[PDB]
Design a protein around this ligand. Structure first.
Ligand SMILES: O=C(N[C@@H]1CCCCNC1=O)c1ccco1
Length: 291
């Protein structure tokens, strides 16, 4: 899977909100482009002159994520974040020249991402009460990953002493995206655990934070809530479910070639962090069959 790279695998089966620190700093921003940010402004003007109903929106930028030594007390992760925008994404990661910008950043800054917007996404491995994960089908008419399979998620919009409010908005955002797209009541969801961070090498290395969320509803009940919104209540065109038993071997199935890169990152991290037991009971051959 060359189109997905793991940047972070969390310990302990996943980290809760209270174990994560953020540093939001203009030192963590994109660098101005070599010949100037006028190239971004020109792409945006061309787009608005065809689609004048489009709007810009602020986004968090991922600079880096440092894990504490394993087994330590106190905060376990530091997220270094900056700010970016939808407009800066369209002019950098989404540009036909994005690979040239990655080579230039290696040359000038020793950092392949220095000239890239790199907006931070969120995604969820969402489990039902009857042990299935939730998948969504993308419209064949959208610009990014048309017709491919995705998991719930989105790209959060801004608004440790401003740090804790930023971590709160990231955890809040993945629940809000589940409620808006799947149409589930908030009180049927667990507090999220962070599983890790995955990069989409088909979008010049932009990253997504991948979370585990449990729902108290069965697969039948989740399907009823999704459908009862009607076609205008969701951006996706369908919902479906895979037993957690079967997610273990998903990379060997025909479904794998249909998954978009951020959804592949969610499922790899689910399998490594929530699956893959370490103890004698769950590791016994009848509960963890060989192959
Ligand atoms: O988040 C937005 N778009 C995403 C962000 C970058 C990664 C995926 N592609 C997109 O177009 C957005 C547009 C306007 C308000 O929010």
């Amino acid at each position: 899977d060359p189109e997905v790279t793991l940047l972070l695998q969390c310990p302990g089966g996943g980290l809760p909100q209270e174990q994560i620190q953020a540093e939001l700093s203009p030192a963590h921003d994109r660098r101005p482009l070599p010949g100037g940010d006028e190239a971004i402004t020109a792409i945006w003007e061309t787009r608005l002159k065809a689609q004048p109903w489009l709007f810009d929106a602020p986004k968090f930028r991922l600079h880096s994520a440092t894990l504490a030594p394993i087994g330590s007390r106190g905060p376990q992760l530091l997220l270094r974040l900056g700010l970016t925008s939808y407009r800066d994404f369209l002019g950098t990661n989404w540009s036909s020249s994005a690979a040239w910008l990655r080579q230039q950043g290696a040359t000038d800054w020793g950092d392949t991402q220095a000239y890239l917007a790199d907006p931070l996404g969120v995604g969820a491995a969402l489990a039902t009460a009857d042990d299935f994960l939730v998948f969504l089908r993308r419209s064949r008419q959208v610009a990014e990953a048309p017709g491919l399979v995705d998991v719930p998620g989105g790209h959060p919009e801004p608004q440790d002493l401003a740090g804790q409010l930023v971590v709160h908005e990231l955890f809040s955002s993945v629940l809000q995206e589940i409620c808006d797209e799947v149409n589930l009541p908030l009180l049927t969801l667990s507090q999220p655990l962070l599983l890790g961070i995955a990069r989409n090498e088909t979008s010049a290395g932009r990253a997504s934070a991948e979370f585990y969320v449990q729902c108290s509803l069965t697969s039948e009940q989740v399907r009823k809530h999704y459908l009862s919104g009607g076609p205008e209540a969701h951006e996706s065109t369908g919902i479906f479910f895979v037993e957690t038993q079967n997610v273990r071997r998903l990379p060997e199935t025909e479904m794998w070639a249909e998954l978009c890169p951020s959804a592949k990152g969610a499922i790899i991290l689910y399998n490594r962090v929530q699956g893959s037991p370490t103890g004698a009971a769950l590791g016994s051959p009848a509960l963890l069959p060989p192959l």
